[PDB]
Amino acid sequence: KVFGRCELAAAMKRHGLDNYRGYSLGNWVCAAKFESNFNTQATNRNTDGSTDYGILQINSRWWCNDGRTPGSRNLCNIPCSALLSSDITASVNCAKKIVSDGNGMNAWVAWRNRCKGTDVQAWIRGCRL
Ligand SMILES: [Cl-]
Ligand SMILES: [Cl-]
Ligand SMILES: [Cl-]
Ligand SMILES: [Cl-]
Ligand SMILES: [Cl-]
Ligand SMILES: [Cl-]
Ligand SMILES: [Cl-]
Ligand code: NA
């Protein structure tokens, strides 16, 4: 599914991401735009052989099982295919674990490079929330 900006903001608000560990909703919407262009089916292969999955590009080295990342962990206890669903529940529940891991949203390279320190409230402007 390719979400609209406000559609995704509403879905993330309903799943408890607004101010989760102090990160306002616009941070999560901005991260999704630049990681995946709001497409749940996005995949990208890394040099190390791991793959990033779904709207928040969650990596198979640590967070999900894809059956082809040798010596990896599955800390979210999910098949990586679950992260590509039109239902963002699995992605949101795993993202809450990642952002609690000590580096906050710096875990998402596109957030650090494109969202951090910008006016992220712009990402939820005009939305009915
Ligand atoms: Cl947009
Ligand atoms: Cl915000
Ligand atoms: Cl594996
Ligand atoms: Cl594991
Ligand atoms: Cl699994
Ligand atoms: Cl959803
Ligand atoms: Cl933090
Ligand atoms: Na894994």
Curated annotation (Swiss-Prot):
Keyword Acyltransferase listed: no
Disulphide bridges, residue numbers: C6-C127, C30-C115, C64-C80, C76-C94
Subcellular location: Secreted
UniProt keyword terms in alphabetical order: Allergen, Antimicrobial, Bacteriolytic enzyme, Disulfide bond, Glycosidase, Hydrolase, Secreted, Signal
Principal EC category: hydrolase
Tissue specificity: In the egg white and polymorphonuclear leukocytes.
Keyword Repeat: no
Residues engaged in binding substrate: D101
Described purpose of this protein according to its UniProt entry: Lysozymes have primarily a bacteriolytic function; those in tissues and body fluids are associated with the monocyte-macrophage system and enhance the activity of immunoagents. Has bacteriolytic activity against M.luteus.
Family of this protein: Belongs to the glycosyl hydrolase 22 family.
Listed name of the protein: Lysozyme C
Lineage summary: Eukaryota, Metazoa, Chordata, Craniata, Vertebrata
